[PDB]
Design a protein around this ligand. Structure first.
Ligand SMILES: [Zn+2]
Ligand SMILES: [Zn+2]
Ligand SMILES: [Zn+2]
Lengths: 129, 101, 65, 1023, 151, 114
């Protein structure tokens, strides 16, 4: 009865704020650091390790400054919170790609203005090489 | 909708030490008679100028007049600056703008 | 790959004419003159000989199993 | 003496014949790879940073030289047996050659005693070798030898065999480097863009791009409005946009006058001076150079904690990160500033409108990356990771104090698998690196037809990303004339993105600019460091690969001398191109690779340099030690690129330049050999394309590739998943001169047909056609079909393994209902056994922890006979076999037939010879097409080709299909036909087969060439 | 038509041409030249329609209106016509010249893509490329037209 | 409209006005050196920018082979019949259509418009 394309999902998640894959890696790193050294506890669960690799492999940003800049840039617009992380995580190359991948954006975003947003994300995301 | 850019030909900022100097030779003939009346001359006037020329061809198409252009500049911007217009019959239209006294 | 047995249009035999066609070409005869000697009055049959390629010559270069 | 116009037609085609005989059709593929494997590979190893290991014990490892051997196969025995290219395809293994590198290590243990050891030919890895390249096993071999190796002599090669799959590196167009471009974008906050991506020679560091933008006047502010428009430059490692003026201060030009000297060359002109005034206001407060360095470092990516660190970071960024190509050392401040000032100067001209904005689609601004340049970038990815693996492996060894053996340090898998991965998958770059690979590269070679194979090798790809998106790659530009075929383009959403190289055009392989740089010094050329800025106002700027070599006092004399050297094959190679921007006093010399250019006859004083004697030698080109290269040596013909073609005048034919009643142009510099060369491989085979509509020519390009025919000669030996071979591939009655070079005459992909254009029984609509049943029974369009089935028995698991044997009902528990008598005692069906429907052709079982049947059945229900069976061992050493199932497809009502031009037409109905409309002489047309197609979705060339075919067959001479030959005309063809007792327009009286009464309308019948498309009904229904 | 275009070019070259109040000189010149070339195609094309006899097969198709159009016959017999790109004539891909063969800053019929040769007669090498440019635009528009219209 | 540099530090001389002598003098900021301006003009701005293109045309375009050559209009100070002509290359003047003639003589370099 829930669908991400139509922006329908359990009411509990409305209060929650989305997080980026790269940003989550920082939160996982903070959790990893304290567990490893701050306290003597059992080794982290396999689930924690699995998502850490996924976030690191798909991390589109180097430092917090790049993450914060994109978050602030997209916050100025009327972008929905669900689209906030989904757009940044996907990093669509062009406006046409984002709308097809994200049906919600095409409802309230024009073909020109959104293009000026995705290209901004491109200037922020950096390559290891 | 027409702007000053579409009706103006050229603009420059000239320097005149005293109000009667009018370093520009060509406009000295007509500015003198207009400036005889002490309008806004009750006190010192800055030695700067914002003389701007108006294209003759563009004015004819819009049927504009010098008084109409000057009125909007004064009314639109208020009393921050004062503008002086020349005779319409002149081949070249001279519009001199100086900051208000 | 090889010259067809007969004309696809009418059915006149053209495979046997290929051997004589090449022999006439090296005999200083013109391309169209050779066709007349073989007896190809129709243009459909002359097509089968004038503009034919014998690809089997290059295939035979490769050694067999 | 001179070439008379009555003889120019034959003379023009003779020089073209020599060009293809020497260069060929895949010279651009081979040349780039040869450069990559000869110099680029050496450069990467030579330019590698020193390897330093520390934890007292210091280890310095350096690579001395690279040795490359011919391809060999390493089996379990390890013997270096030669590996033939054909063996690679059959065994499904990559065709590649070993790579060897010399490693010299110097070790010092703080004992004041330095000793080193020599490692000769270290097995660094291996490099895939393009077929027919310098390192290939089939280079310089006569046609006789190629047949002995089961390789087609007519096959041009130029591809890589990876895992048994032939892959062609599709050229990817990229924006040219070390070039200043000014573009106008209405979406950006700034009016103009000073984009200029700068990179060193071949590649020492990743490409760095800087955008010297100019803020738009739209914004309004208290101070912004006053100064108005100011220039802001964004550094590659600086997030924020810093004023350009401050950059010069960081270089060392503290004085403000020096800033204007480098930017403004003509102080007399006041229009440009006023534009630079606002830029100085922002940077005025920064007067000292140290402050400028401090200012730039403030917004750096990783600002330093201490104040002094900010200056150091800015110093490194400007010195190294910024403008790497102009200078990489620490003593190039003057050179770097001059280039930076030029970028601002270029912006000023565009802003004022005195200089036209650079065209996005201009191919001169775009460079083509071939297998050479592409693989060169890839080779750095593994090599850089190779050092890390050695460093990481030694790191744990070094800290322990014991020496580390190099044999373990060097990783062969990364070098071997790294190149093999992308070349097979098509995803460029390493998969581990967390990015998006560029897909669409290294696609499987299309071997359906020989013409398709040639087109794929010369295929081009439009740029992707921001560059491609902003521009209009799909739209046809004027620069494509003679360089990229205009007609040829795939139809669909990706229309115009994929194109094909022009027949005569080739892409520059690449050369070192050092000989050109040294040449200028001995002449009047003066470097920037020697002269004052005031001397640049009147002189002309000289550029070598985008570098600021220095101005020259007299441009005319130097270029004339430079042109003479190019024609004489002196230190300046004919590949190099010199561009003279007269309106801008700029002389640009480019030597880097990726430049598309085509040959052009040189014209001097309205007279061709190509004389009769040159043609006479060419006529005897064989056994006389004369080739195309001699023509360039004599200076009769040179090469012009897109940028040089900008300022080079051209003449279509000598008749245009010899004399005219009114002189259109009295100064012709070059003359085209023949305009028809603009067409590509697929477009060249079309007669009268000018008579044909543009979409139809584009449509044929797609249909021509889909046409089925003899793709190569060694089809029997090889094994292909899909391969359609025609029973009787016959050369057309109407053929183009360029068809000879394509070798399509030797291996055609169609059969001629006497086509009568009439509406017979109304069984053919606009998209349809009527065939002759009797003709098909004689082999009118029949063709064979080959499908290769491939399987291996590998011991993937210790407990469970695959084996080849007969799956008996008793020993096997799980099985599918099918006939198993076909399989032999070895589990493989022997050649010569008819197979129909669902039948097992190879036996394979898995010994699960009793065995489960996992054999492979026929893909479709078609009835076919196995042609040949091959048993081999894969690269892993496990048994591997391939079998080719051969089936015969008879043309039927569902097959789709397409002419050489127009839309494909399905065979609406098949009629026997009796039912077909016979003429007076008794010639029943083989095929009948709908007349209603001719108007819109067909071309008059079909009627002209029919008229030419009738004359060609009647007169026994192959007609000429030159697109722009004035000799061939419709009226001339009609007159020739009338001499053989036929209607001048080709119309004939056809008697209806059913009713013998004459048809009121006289049908038009002629031998039109036709081709059978791969689309067949049997494949669809059998699925 | 070709002579008339030259006369228009000469008038603009000598500044004799006067722009219309609703348009600029550069756009006005492009409009005048387009009409001369457009009118020639229609006039020559119309004469071609009258040229065809009743027995002629080309006339039968168009007369009944089943397939084809009078413009198609015009491009086959009389003249192909101007090859407009992006709603305008062939742009100056090079510096003020459509192709290298044409002189700099050339605004003539052949230079700007006017195709004066019918399909039957055969197009000149310059015209063939200009014809391809016009056809390429149609294919691109057709490819996107179906995608948008289907949506 | 022009730009002048001081002799001390060779820096921009922004226009400054003094209230004592009532004379506009170009004075540098960082260095105390100041010089008077005799032009009495700070800058000019042509909105229509109808600047003659003759000064912009370079005399070295005579040897250009691509540029058309016409003998109808000879050079004023040479008499040579041959003369290369072309249209304005400035984007600002793209709206207008005009011809500019340049003498074909090797050293004359004369530019004129009819
Ligand atoms: Zn026959
Ligand atoms: Zn100073
Ligand atoms: Zn002169």
């Amino acid at each position: 009865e829930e669908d991400a394309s139509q922006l329908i999902f359990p009411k509990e998640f409305e209060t929650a704020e989305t997080l980026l894959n790269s940003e989550v890696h920082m939160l996982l790193e903070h959790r990893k650091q304290q567990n490893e050294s701050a306290e003597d506890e059992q080794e982290l669960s396999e689930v924690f390790m699995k998502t850490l690799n996924y976030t690191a492999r798909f991390s589109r940003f180097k430092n917090r400054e790049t993450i914060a800049s994109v978050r602030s840039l997209l916050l100025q617009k009327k972008l929905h919170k669900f689209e906030l992380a989904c757009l940044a995580n996907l990093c669509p190359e062009t406006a046409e790609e984002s709308k097809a991948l994200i049906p919600s954006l095409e409802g309230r975003f024009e073909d020109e203005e959104l293009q000026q947003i995705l290209d901004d994300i491109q200037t922020k995301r950096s390559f290891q090489y | 909708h027409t702007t000053l850019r579409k009706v103006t030909a050229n603009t420059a900022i000239y320097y005149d030490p005293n109000p009667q100097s009018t370093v520009v030779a060509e406009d000295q003939e007509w500015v003198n008679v207009y400036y005889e009346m002490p309008d806004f001359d009750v006190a010192r006037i800055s030695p700067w100028l914002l003389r701007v020329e108006l294209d003759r061809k563009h004015m004819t198409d819009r049927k504009l007049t010098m008084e109409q252009i000057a009125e909007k500049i004064n009314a639109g911007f208020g009393d921050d600056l004062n503008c002086i217009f020349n005779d319409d019959n002149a081949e070249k239209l001279v519009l001199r703008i100086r900051i208000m006294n | 790959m090889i010259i067809p047995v007969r004309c696809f249009t009418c059915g006149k035999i053209v495979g046997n004419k290929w051997e004589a066609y090449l022999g006439l070409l090296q005999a200083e005869y013109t391309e169209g003159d050779a066709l007349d000697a073989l007896g190809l009055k129709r243009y459909c049959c002359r097509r089968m000989l004038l503009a034919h390629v014998d690809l089997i010559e290059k295939l035979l270069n490769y050694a067999p199993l | 003496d001179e070439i008379t116009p009555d003889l120019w037609q034959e003379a023009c085609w003779i020089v073209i014949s020599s060009y293809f005989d020497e260069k060929g059709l895949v010279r651009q593929q081979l040349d780039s790879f040869d450069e990559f494997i000869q110099m680029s590979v050496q450069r990467i190893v030579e330019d590698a940073p020193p390897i330093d290991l520390q934890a007292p014990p210091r280890y310095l490892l350096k690579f001395e030289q690279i040795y490359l051997s011919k391809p060999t196969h390493w089996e379990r025995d390890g013997a270096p047996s030669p590996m033939m290219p054909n063996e690679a395809r059959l065994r499904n293994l990559t065709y590649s050659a070993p790579l060897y590198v010399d490693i010299t290590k110097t070790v010092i243990k703080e004992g004041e005693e330095q000793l080193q050891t020599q490692h000769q030919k270290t097995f660094i890895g291996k490099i895939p070798i393009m077929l027919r390249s310098t390192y290939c096993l089939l280079n310089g071999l006569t046609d006789r030898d190629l047949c002995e190796l089961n390789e087609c002599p007519l096959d041009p090669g130029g591809y890589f065999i990876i895992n048994g799959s032939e892959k062609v590196l599709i050229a990817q167009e990229k924006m040219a480097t070390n070039t200043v471009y000014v573009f106008a974008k209405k979406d950006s906050k700034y009016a103009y863009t000073g984009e200029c991506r700068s990179c060193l020679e071949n590649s020492s560091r990743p490409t760095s791009t800087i955008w010297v933008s100019m803020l738009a006047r739209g914004g309004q502010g208290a101070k912004k409005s006053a100064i108005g428009q100011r220039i802001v430059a964004t550094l590659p490692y600086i997030k924020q946009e810093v004023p350009i003026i401050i950059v010069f201060r960081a270089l060392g030009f503290v004085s403000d006058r020096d800033i204007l000297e480098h930017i403004i060359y003509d102080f007399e002109d006041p229009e440009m001076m006023e534009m630079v005034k606002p830029s100085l206001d922002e940077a005025f407060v920064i007067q000292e150079q140290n402050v400028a360095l401090n200012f730039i470092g403030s917004r750096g990516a990783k600002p330093g904690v201490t104040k002094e660190k900010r200056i150091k970071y800015a110093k490194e960024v400007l010195q190294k990160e910024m403008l790497p190509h102009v200078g990489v050392s620490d003593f190039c401040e003057t050179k770097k500033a001059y280039f930076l000032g030029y970028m601002v100067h270029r912006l000023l001209l565009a802003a004022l409108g005195r200089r036209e904005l650079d065209d996005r689609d201009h191919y001169g601004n775009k460079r083509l990356d071939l297998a050479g340049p592409l693989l060169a970038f890839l080779f750095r990815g593994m090599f850089k990771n190779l050092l890390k693996e050695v460093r990481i492996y030694a790191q744990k060894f070094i800290d322990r104090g014991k020496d580390f053996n190099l044999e373990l340090a060097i990783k062969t898998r990364i070098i071997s698998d790294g190149l093999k991965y992308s070349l097979a998958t098509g995803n460029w770059g390493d998969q581990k690196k967390a990015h998006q690979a560029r897909a669409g590269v290294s696609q499987v070679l299309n071997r359906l037809t020989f013409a398709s194979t040639l087109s794929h090798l010369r295929r081009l790809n439009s740029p992707i990303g921001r560059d491609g998106k902003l521009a209009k790659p799909r739209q046809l530009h004027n620069t494509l004339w003679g360089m990229v075929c205009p007609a040829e383009t795939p139809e669909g959403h990706a229309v115009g993105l994929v194109k094909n190289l022009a027949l005569m055009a080739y892409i520059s392989v690449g050369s070192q600019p050092s000989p050109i740089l040294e040449f200028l010094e001995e002449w009047s050329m003066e470097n920037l460091e020697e002269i004052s800025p005031a001397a640049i106002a009147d002189a002309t700027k000289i550029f070598v690969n985008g570098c600021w070599v220095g101005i020259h006092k007299d441009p005319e004399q130097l270029m004339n001398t430079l042109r003479k050297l190019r024609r004489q094959m002196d230190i300046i190679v004919s590949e190099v191109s010199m561009i003279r921007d007269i309106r801008e006093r700029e002389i640009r010399i480019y030597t880097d690779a990726g430049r598309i250019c085509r040959p052009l006859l040189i014209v001097e004083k309205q007279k061709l340099l190509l004389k009769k004697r040159h043609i006479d030698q060419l006529k005897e080109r064989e056994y006389n030690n004369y080739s195309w290269q001699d023509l360039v040596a004599s200076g009769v013909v040179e090469y012009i690129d897109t940028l040089e073609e900008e300022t080079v005048m051209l003449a279509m034919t000598p008749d245009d330049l010899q004399e005219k009643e009114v002189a259109y142009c009295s100064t012709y510099t070059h003359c085209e050999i023949h305009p028809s060369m603009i067409l590509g491989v697929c477009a060249s085979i079309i007669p009268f394309p000018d008579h044909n509509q543009s979409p139809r020519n584009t449509y044929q390009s797609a249909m021509g590739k889909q046409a089925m025919g003899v793709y190569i000669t060694n089809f029997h030996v090889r094994m292909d998943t899909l391969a359609h071979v025609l029973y009787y591939p016959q050369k057309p009655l109407v053929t183009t001169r360029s068809m000879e070079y394509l070798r399509f005459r030797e291996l055609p992909a169609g059969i001629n047909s006497i086509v009568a254009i009439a509406s017979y029984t109304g069984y053919n609509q606009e998209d349809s056609v009527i065939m002759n049943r009797s003709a098909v029974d004689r082999g009118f369009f029949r063709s064979v079909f080959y499908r290769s089935y491939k399987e291996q028995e590998s011991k993937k698991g210790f407990d469970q393994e695959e084996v080849f044997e007969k799956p008996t009902r008793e020993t096997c528990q799980g099985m599918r209902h099918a006939i198993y008598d076909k399989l032999d005692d070895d589990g493989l069906i022997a050649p010569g056994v008819r197979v129909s429907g669902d039948d097992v052709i190879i036996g394979k079982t898995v010994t699960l922890p009793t065995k489960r049947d996992c054999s492979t059945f026929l893909r479709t229900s078609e009835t076919g006979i196995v042609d040949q069976v091959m048993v081999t061992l894969n690269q892993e050493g496990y048994k591997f076999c391939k079998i080719r199932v051969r089936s015969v497809r008879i043309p039927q009502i569902g097959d789709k037939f397409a002419s050489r031009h127009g839309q494909k037409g399905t065979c609406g109905i098949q009629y026997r010879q009796e039912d077909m409309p016979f003429t007076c002489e008794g010639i029943t047309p083989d095929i009948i097409i709908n007349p209603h197609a001719i108007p819109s979705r067909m071309t008059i060339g079909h009627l002209i080709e029919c008229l030419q075919g009738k004359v060609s067959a009647n007169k026994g001479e192959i007609g000429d299909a030159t697109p722009f030959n004035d000799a061939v005309n419709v009226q001339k063809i009609s007159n020739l036909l009338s001499d053989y007792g036929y209607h001048l327009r080709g119309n004939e009286v056809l008697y209806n087969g059913f009713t013998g009464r004459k048809i009121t309308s006289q049908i038009f019948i002629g031998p039109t060439y036709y081709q059978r498309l791969k689309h067949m009904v049997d494949d669809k229904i059998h699925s | 038509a070709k002579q008339d275009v030259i006369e228009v070019i000469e008038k603009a070259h000598n500044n004799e041409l006067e722009p219309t109040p609703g348009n600029t000189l550069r756009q006005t010149f492009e409009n005048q030249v387009n009409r001369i070339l457009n009118d020639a195609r229609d006039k020559t094309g119309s004469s071609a329609q009258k040229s065809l006899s009743e027995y002629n097969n080309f006339k039968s198709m168009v007369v009944s209106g089943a397939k084809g159009s009078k413009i198609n016959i015009s491009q086959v017999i009389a003249v192909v016509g101007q090859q407009n790109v992006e709603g305008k004539r062939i742009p100056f891909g090079f510096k003020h010249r459509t192709l290298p063969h044409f002189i700099k800053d050339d605004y003539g019929p052949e230079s700007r893509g006017f195709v004066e040769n019918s399909y039957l007669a055969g197009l000149t090498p310059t015209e063939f490329f200009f014809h391809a440019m016009g056809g390429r635009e149609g294919l691109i528009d057709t490819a996107v037209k179906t995608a948008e219209t289907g949506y | 409209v022009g730009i002048r540099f001081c002799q001390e530090c060779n820096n921009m001389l922004y226009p400054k006005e003094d209230k004592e002598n009532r004379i506009l003098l170009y004075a540098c900021r960082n260095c105390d050196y100041q010089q008077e301006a005799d032009n009495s003009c700070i800058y000019v701005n042509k909105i229509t920018h109808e600047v003659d293109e003759l000064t912009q045309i370079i005399a070295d375009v005579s040897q250009d082979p691509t540029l058309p050559r016409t003998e109808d209009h000879p050079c004023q100070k040479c008499g040579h019949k041959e003369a290369v002509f072309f249209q304005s290359h400035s984007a600002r003047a793209e709206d207008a259509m005009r011809l500019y003639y340049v003498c074909t003589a090797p050293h004359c370099g004369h530019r004129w418009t009819e």
